[PDB]
Design a binder for this molecule. Structure first.
Ligand SMILES: CCCCCCCCCCCCCCCCC[C@@H](O)O[C@H](CO[C@H](O)CCCCCCCCCCCCCCC)COP(=O)(O)OCC[N+](C)(C)C
Ligand SMILES: CCCCCCCCCCCCCCCCC[C@@H](O)O[C@H](CO[C@H](O)CCCCCCCCCCCCCCC)COP(=O)(O)OCC[N+](C)(C)C
Ligand SMILES: CCCCCCCC/C=C\CCCCCCCC(=O)OC[C@H](COP(=O)(O)OCCN)OC(=O)CCCCCCC/C=C\CCCCCCCC
Ligand SMILES: CCCCCCCC/C=C\CCCCCCCC(=O)OC[C@H](COP(=O)(O)OCCN)OC(=O)CCCCCCC/C=C\CCCCCCCC
Ligand SMILES: CCCCCCCC/C=C\CCCCCCCC(=O)O[C@H](COC(=O)CCCCCCC/C=C/CCCCCCCC)COP(=O)(O)OCCN
Lengths: 114, 347, 129, 98, 70, 99, 105, 303, 71, 83
């Protein structure tokens, strides 16, 4: 009863965000504050179309938006940010309350830079 | 037992049947069956003795097995189509399982063996309740899924029930066994018409409940549980025996009594569906039920049996307690044939 | 694949049922039923039903078969049908079971009534006389 | 329908047949009933978890509880029968007959 | 006197020291010097699986920072 | 896998230690020379079974407290506890807890 | 028989639990939510006879989602053919299916 | 290195239950104006080893007619359950991190009665069977109130995860939030392990004894984690381990103290104690602890 | 971001399976490569056997029981 | 008046556990209907996001729907912070 159309492997090639869950968690709040427009556009598209194949283009824009965000952090406060995510990456449950001192350092480093 | 506890148990039995009748979810129907069984056991053992305990354990075993296969049918139905609503079954295997579970719950042959023994074990009030109220829930469930049933299996059990009741009633001196076999035959008659018309099923159920209530109340009034104990009743209360004879004639399906109304209509309905052999066999078989009803009438009201001297003292006392609605039951179980077209009320 | 561990557990389940269904020496039948209950709890747990498997293992084994043993002593193709997504930051079985107090009010009412009636009924049945 | 459902259904059928055999020892009858209930619980849980039907996670617990109550009732009955005969043999229950 | 009960208690205490301490050190050794990751609720498990896939060595605890962003 | 291995190790150790206990003194030569059925015990077992079923109903309470329907959950949870209390009171007043 | 008390009083005693696609807690969907939704909206207000006749496509899809019989048959056929080709020797699995692939986040 | 962790959990527990006999004898002796063992070993320290060797070199008296199967099975189940109940506990980090760890421990404790039932059944004696029935009835009766008290306490924790109990008691102990529940829990754990004042009842005998003493220690450790919450610093868990071990030792010594201080109940008296004093208060305080977080808007996080 | 990665990964695995099926089913007479079993054209979430059917037993075991067995 | 006080005093003696049990259960039933923090508990439960907030498609007719999380439109949790 029909043939299931799948995008070719070339249409699924994108520059991946290759950072661990601790690094992603340490930047989650600012990443949500910054990359909100492409992320919401992708999710609105993802819930309305209800089909992975129909949103392949919008999902490539969220990868870029995230790469750009991490590039800005790298080029401005890699020092302070690396001390923050290394403290969050130590906790088994990766709690935010076990490194408020480090978070403050990285919170002042992005408000006085970006 | 305590009257408050007995009232609570009877109300719980009623609530189990009503929960079966008003729910649309298979789990809640099964829960109603469970609650009904749970509260029915003490009622059968209200008068404690070994016979009542044996009857209660037999009844519990049969009803628990039926409930397990009921649950099994529900799960199988759920696996094939994920639905909990009580409608026609989506699986053929599930339907047969459902059909046999309700056959055990009603007492249809070949699952009839428990009815005579349980009825013999319990008292007359427990027997009245068991043979009248305990048929509403399984029959209502059967009515709700009648479009799903395989006619072959269902009609096979109906005809078997009629034959078995007719044959087994011929061998009985005990009145409770006679009532149990009569109930088996009437269940067969009711279930023979589910595939075609559930209104006829309900009409037969109501007529049968009326006649069974009248018969059990008359047996309680003249506190007799055997043929010979009832043969003494003319020497104290002959009006009771006359009413009992008319009720027995009605229960045998003799026109123009009330008991002729169901079979007639049922036969009529089956003839609409080009079924001729089965109704003929059913009527010729119901002649057996009529025969042992007639034997009871001969022993009770049409001849006068030898009495005893101590009966004289019983002539000096009256019944302290009365059954209300007994006159209404007698009248409704003998003289409602002219009101037959009222069945359009979908009773 | 561990040679169909679910199939192995189901086979042990069936074998235990065959064992205690012969009804030899009801204490031995109860022991076979205990082993079968443990195996079925393992099946449910391996499937992902942690709370329901532990309910089997606690209620069934530790209370009900324990009472059965008390009374007796007084006398003389898998892995493929599974899902793809995740559950979120909760366990769906727990949320559905906890919905008993907000969604299943009617079920709570009927179950509580049935349990109270069962207490009363046991009292009345065992009164004796 | 995979083989796990087939095995659970087969276990249920084996338990039902064992209950219907009645070699002796009504306690074995109750044991067979409760084995049937255990198989029912397992298979219903498997179906409900497999189809991700959240609100039906209520159902197995309910079933368990109700069935356990029945066991209690059954046990009571068994006990009372023994008090009349001294043992729970099936063949003692022949006072009432067809 | 009463302090002669202290030796046995001490021995008992030392034994009860061994399990918990051992666990902690083992969780340091198999987890690259960090506490063993806790995975409830299956979003945590997805995080661990993503970490294991992006480590390049099939080990979730090898953390990739900005030096891997290129 | 970890839990299965742990139980296997526990059971294996217990079996090994019991069998060596039962066989170490079996290697050296030596001389090598009713009815009552109390009903109260059955009734306490049955009472435990019923209260255990009601505890099984009570168990999901820690998760039931995050529902946005706090009033209905509190009513139903309280109702179950009250229901449990009635069973205890009825059994108490009917001489069900005596010896 | 069935006395529809809930519909008369608007109670909803047990209708909340009858189907997968009825307002689950935390909006958690059933595995076959869309198929059941389609089947229900096909068969609404039509009657059981016409529902069984005219909505067989949706019901078949719903059952296929529920039990995955045809899907498992297809997968088994593919696996058996691949096994035969490996035994005889005209097929070689790629690095993807031998664990030698490059995983993606 | 998971096998090494399992072994480093099992072996030290068995040594601890071996030397708990020494500690109990020493403590009871000094409460009785005497000493305990002080001859075998420098301070009695070799007494447990001598006891174990003597027990393991003595003739075993098989009943010569009883069910040898259940006779051998009962100690296996007892000791296996005793050693299994230690896995869920977080000291600070648990060997197995279970979501429903508390429920798992409840289920293990519930199984613990099959050993009593089977040992009584396989004694081939009517009097020992009577004693076994009494023990089973007492155990199930008190595990009822254990379960109810436990869920009432956990309503302030937010889940059944035992690790979260460390998070709940970060600032204050649970003993201050509910001391009545802790009192009834302590008495119920006395009655659960058949310890005085609730002690109404070669090789395999030592196996049973090891299981009972391991259950005593585990129950006291569970009480310490449940009601006496130590502070845990993720960068030095040894502080938590030492604190938790000290509290567990204190509770075990309190068990010995209680055994040395009181007479024992009758059967009907402890049955009445439970069913007429603990159960009513347990139900009332369960109602109270259900209502409390909602009234004060202090419901714990996890769902 | 996780949703985008999940979608891309599932699509890639499905395409790899489709290509291998095209290779394997080349001599089956009545086969049609990549044929749906549903009448609808709506997207249907693949099973676990769809994605890990042709892969090695180790990662099948992972994807099936890793979260359940991780304690 | 006098009968109830006499009964309560006679129960506080020789039955203190039952008096305590009934007092605690009665308070558990009564107080939640009178506490002013239960609505706060309900609101705290409503404020815990377990699911993703699916954005709405803008049509030029949603003034109260924020266009960004930092925008003032929408619910706020200052009352939670101050609690
Ligand atoms: C002896 C013959 C039987 C006894 C006759 C009854 C005697 C006592 C009855 C006293 C009053 C009862 C009437 C109930 C009051 C309200 C009824 C209403 O609420 O319910 C209706 C139902 O009312 C009944 O239908 C009418 C009952 C009338 C029974 C008498 C007819 C029996 C056949 C003729 C025999 C002659 C008897 C006449 C002399 C008394 C709506 O039914 P519905 O929920 O929508 O459909 C469910 C049933 N389905 C599933 C079959 C479709
Ligand atoms: C109406 C006529 C009654 C007289 C007839 C009496 C016959 C027996 C009485 C038993 C029937 C009880 C009716 C209660 C039905 C429950 C459902 C209804 O009440 O709504 C619930 C309202 O809950 C109420 O709080 C129920 C309170 C009732 C329980 C307290 C006492 C019950 C005693 C009943 C008898 C039990 C044994 C006897 C005790 C004396 C739902 O709450 P809500 O949150 O909006 O919706 C949930 C769905 N969501 C999640 C999508 C939002
Ligand atoms: C003996 C008890 C056996 C089961 C104990 C473990 C149950 C448990 O809760 O954990 C199971 C554990 C994790 O569960 P969660 O708490 O949900 O956390 C993991 C999810 N992140 O994972 C497992 O499922 C491991 C076990 C599954 C397979 C085997 C299960 C046990 C089978 C027992 C068979 C023995 C039966 C013999 C008869 C017993 C009679 C005494
Ligand atoms: C906390 C640490 C505690 C450790 C736990 C327990 C560890 C167990 C260690 C066991 C120590 C060795 C036990 C040996 C004693 C066995 C019994 C014994 O004394 O032997 C007597 C027995 C009597 O023989 P007859 O003279 O013929 O008697 C006839 C008269 N009717 O003699 C024997 O059979 C000796 C058997 C040969 C033993 C040689 C092996 C050396 C021991 C190694 C240990 C073996 C088991 C471990
Ligand atoms: C209304 C609130 C509902 C919720 C609270 C209830 C939660 C749990 C409490 C109920 C548990 C069940 C109790 C069962 C009652 C049976 C009592 C009984 O039978 O005992 C009687 C006697 O007990 C009684 O007196 C009956 C109850 C007496 C009243 C108890 C307290 C009533 C209310 C007191 C406080 C009310 C509110 C507090 C007022 C202060 C302000 C807050 C005989 O005792 P025996 O030990 O058998 O024989 C002794 C000789 N061998």
């Amino acid at each position: 009863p029909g043939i299931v159309e799948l995008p070719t492997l070339e249409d699924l090639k994108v520059q991946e965000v290759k950072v661990s869950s601790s690094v992603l968690k340490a930047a989650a709040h600012h990443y949500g504050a910054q990359c909100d427009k492409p992320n919401k556009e992708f999710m609105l598209c993802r819930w309305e179309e209800k089909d992975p194949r129909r949103c392949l283009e919008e999902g490539k824009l969220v990868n870029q938006c995230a790469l750009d965000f991490f590039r800005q952090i790298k080029r401005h406060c890699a020092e302070p940010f690396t001390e923050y995510w290394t403290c969050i990456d130590y906790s088994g449950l990766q709690l935010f309350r076990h490194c408020r001192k480090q978070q403050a350092k990285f919170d002042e480093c992005v408000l006085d830079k970006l | 037992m305590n009257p408050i506890i007995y009232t609570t148990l009877i109300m719980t039995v009623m609530s189990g049947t009503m929960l079966v009748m008003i729910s649309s979810h298979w789990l809640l129907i099964w829960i109603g069956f469970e609650m009904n069984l749970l509260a029915m056991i003490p009622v059968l053992m209200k008068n404690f003795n070994p016979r009542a305990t044996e009857a209660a354990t037999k009844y519990f075993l049969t009803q628990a097995t039926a409930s397990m296969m009921l649950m099994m049918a529900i799960i199988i139905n759920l696996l094939y189509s994920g639905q909990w609503t009580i409608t026609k079954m989506f699986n053929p295997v599930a339907m047969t399982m459902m059909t046999m579970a309700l056959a055990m719950k009603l007492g249809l042959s070949p699952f009839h063996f428990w009815v005579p023994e349980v009825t013999q074990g319990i008292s007359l009030q427990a027997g009245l309740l068991l043979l009248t109220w305990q048929k509403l829930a399984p029959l209502s469930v059967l009515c709700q899924i009648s479009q799903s049933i395989n006619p072959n299996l269902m009609l096979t059990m109906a005809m078997l029930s009629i034959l078995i009741g007719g044959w087994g009633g011929l061998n009985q001196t005990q009145l409770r066994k006679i009532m149990a076999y009569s109930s088996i035959a009437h269940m067969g008659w009711m279930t023979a018409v589910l595939p075609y018309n559930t209104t006829m099923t309900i009409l037969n159920l109501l007529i049968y409940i009326t006649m069974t209530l009248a018969m059990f109340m008359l047996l309680i009034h003249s506190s007799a549980t055997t043929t010979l104990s009832l043969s003494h009743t003319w020497n104290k209360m002959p009006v009771i025996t006359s009413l009992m004879m008319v009720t027995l004639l009605s229960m045998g399906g003799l026109p123009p009594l009330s008991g002729f109304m169901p079979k007639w209509m049922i036969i009529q309905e089956m003839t609409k569906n080009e079924s001729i052999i089965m109704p003929t066999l059913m009527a010729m078989t119901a002649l057996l039920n009529l025969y042992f009803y007639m034997r009871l009438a001969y022993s009770s009201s049409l001849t006068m049996f030898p009495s005893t001297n101590n009966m004289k003292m019983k002539w000096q006392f009256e019944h302290t307690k009365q059954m209300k609605l007994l006159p209404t039951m007698i009248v409704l179980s003998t003289l409602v044939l002219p009101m037959t077209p009222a069945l359009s009320s979908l009773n | 694949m561990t040679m169909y561990i679910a199939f192995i557990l189901s086979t042990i389940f069936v074998i235990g049922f065959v064992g205690f269904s012969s009804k030899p020496s009801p204490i031995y039948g109860g022991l076979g039923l205990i082993v079968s209950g443990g195996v079925g709890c393992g099946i449910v747990l391996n499937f992902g039903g942690s709370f329901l498997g532990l309910m089997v293992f606690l209620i069934y084994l530790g209370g009900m078969l324990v009472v059965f043993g008390y009374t007796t002593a007084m006398a003389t193709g898998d892995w493929v049908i599974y899902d793809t997504g995740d559950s979120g930051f909760f366990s769906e079985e727990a949320m559905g079971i906890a919905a008993l107090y907000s969604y299943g009010t009617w079920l709570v009412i009927v179950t509580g009534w049935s349990l109270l009636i069962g207490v009363v009924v046991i009292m009345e049945i065992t009164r004796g006389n | 329908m995979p083989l796990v459902y087939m095995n659970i259904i087969m276990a249920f059928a084996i338990a039902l047949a064992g209950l219907l055999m009645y070699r002796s020892h009504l306690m074995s009858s109750l044991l067979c009933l409760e084995g049937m209930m255990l198989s029912l619980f397992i298979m219903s849980t498997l179906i409900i978890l497999n189809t991700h039907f959240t609100l039906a996670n209520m159902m197995p617990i309910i079933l368990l509880v109700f069935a356990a109550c029945e066991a209690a009732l059954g046990l009571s009955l068994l006990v009372m029968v023994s008090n009349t005969y001294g043992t729970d043999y099936v063949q003692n229950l022949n006072l009432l007959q067809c | 006197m009463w302090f002669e009960i202290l030796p046995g208690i001490a021995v008992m205490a030392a034994c009860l020291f061994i399990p918990g301490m051992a666990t902690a050190h083992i969780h340091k050794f198999t987890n690259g010097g960090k506490e063993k990751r806790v995975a409830h609720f299956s979003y945590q498990w997805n995080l661990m699986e993503r970490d294991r896939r992006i480590s390049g060595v099939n080990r979730y605890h090898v953390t990739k920072g900005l030096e891997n962003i290129d | 896998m970890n839990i299965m291995l742990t139980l296997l190790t526990n059971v294996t150790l217990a079996s090994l230690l019991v069998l060596i206990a039962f066989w170490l003194p079996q290697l050296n030569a030596y001389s090598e020379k009713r009815l009552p059925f109390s009903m109260k015990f059955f009734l306490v077992a049955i009472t435990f079974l019923l209260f255990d079923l009601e505890i099984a109903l009570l168990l999901p309470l820690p998760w039931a407290s995050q529902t946005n329907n706090l009033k209905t959950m509190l009513t139903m949870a309280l109702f179950l506890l009250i229901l449990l209390a009635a069973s205890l009171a009825y059994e108490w007043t009917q001489k069900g807890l005596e010896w | 028989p069935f006395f529809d008390v809930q519909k008369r009083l608007g109670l909803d005693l047990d209708r909340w639990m009858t189907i997968q696609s009825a307002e689950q807690p935390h909006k958690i969907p059933g595995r076959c939510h869309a198929f059941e939704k389609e089947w229900i909206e096909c068969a609404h207000g039509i009657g059981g006879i016409r529902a069984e006749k005219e909505c067989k496509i949706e019901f078949d899809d719903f059952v296929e989602c529920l039990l995955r019989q045809k899907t498992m048959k297809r997968l088994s056929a593919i696996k058996r053919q691949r096994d035969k080709l490996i035994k005889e020797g005209k097929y070689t699995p790629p690095p993807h299916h031998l664990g030698k692939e490059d995983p993606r986040p | 290195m998971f096998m090494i962790n399992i072994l480093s959990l099992i072996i030290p527990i068995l040594l601890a239950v071996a030397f708990l006999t020494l500690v109990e004898r020493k403590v009871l002796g000094y409460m009785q104006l005497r000493k305990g063992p002080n001859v075998v070993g420098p301070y009695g320290l070799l007494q447990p080893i001598a006891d174990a060797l003597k027990l393991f070199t003595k003739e075993p008296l098989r009943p010569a007619t009883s069910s040898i199967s259940m006779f051998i099975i009962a100690p296996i189940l007892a000791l296996s359950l005793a050693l299994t109940m230690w896995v869920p506990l977080p000291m600070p980090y648990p060997l197995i991190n279970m979501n429903l760890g508390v429920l798992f421990m409840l289920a293990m404790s519930s199984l613990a009665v099959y050993s009593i039932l089977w040992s009584g059944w396989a004694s081939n004696s009517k009097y020992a069977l009577i004693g076994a029935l009494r023990a089973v009835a007492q155990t199930i009766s008190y595990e009822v109130t254990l379960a109810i008290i436990l869920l009432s306490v956990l309503l302030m924790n937010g889940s059944y995860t035992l690790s979260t109990l460390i998070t709940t008691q970060e600032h204050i102990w649970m003993i201050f939030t509910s001391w009545p529940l802790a009192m009834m829990w302590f008495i119920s754990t006395l009655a659960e392990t058949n310890r005085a004042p609730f002690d109404l009842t070669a090789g395999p005998f030592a196996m049973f004894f090891m299981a009972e003493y391991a259950n005593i220690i585990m129950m006291n450790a569970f009480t310490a984690i449940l009601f006496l919450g130590a502070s845990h610093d993720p960068h030095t868990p040894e502080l938590y381990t030492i604190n938790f071990v000290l509290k567990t030792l204190a509770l075990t010594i309190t068990f010995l103290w209680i055994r040395a201080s009181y007479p024992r109940f009758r059967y009907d008296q402890l049955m009445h104690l439970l069913w007429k004093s603990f159960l009513p208060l347990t139900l009332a305080l369960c109602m109270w602890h259900i209502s409390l977080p909602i009234m004060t808007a202090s419901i714990p996080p996890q769902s | 971001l996780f949703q985008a990665e999940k979608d891309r990964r599932v699509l890639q695995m499905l395409r790899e399976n489709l290509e291998e099926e095209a290779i394997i089913m080349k001599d089956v007479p009545d086969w049609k490569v990549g044929e749906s079993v549903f009448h609808t054209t709506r997207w249907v979430t693949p099973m676990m056997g769809e994605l890990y059917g042709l892969r090695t037993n180790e990662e099948i075991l992972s994807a099936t029981y890793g979260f359940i067995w991780y304690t | 008046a006098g009968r109830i006080a006499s009964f309560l005093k006679n129960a506080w003696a020789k039955e203190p556990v039952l008096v305590a049990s009934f007092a605690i259960g009665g308070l558990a039933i009564i107080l939640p209907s009178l506490s002013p923090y239960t609505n706060y508990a309900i609101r705290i439960n409503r404020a815990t996001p377990y699911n993703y907030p699916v954005p709405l498609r803008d049509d030029g007719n949603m003034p109260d729907v924020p266009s960004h999380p930092q925008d003032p439109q929408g619910p706020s949790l200052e009352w939670l912070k101050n609690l």
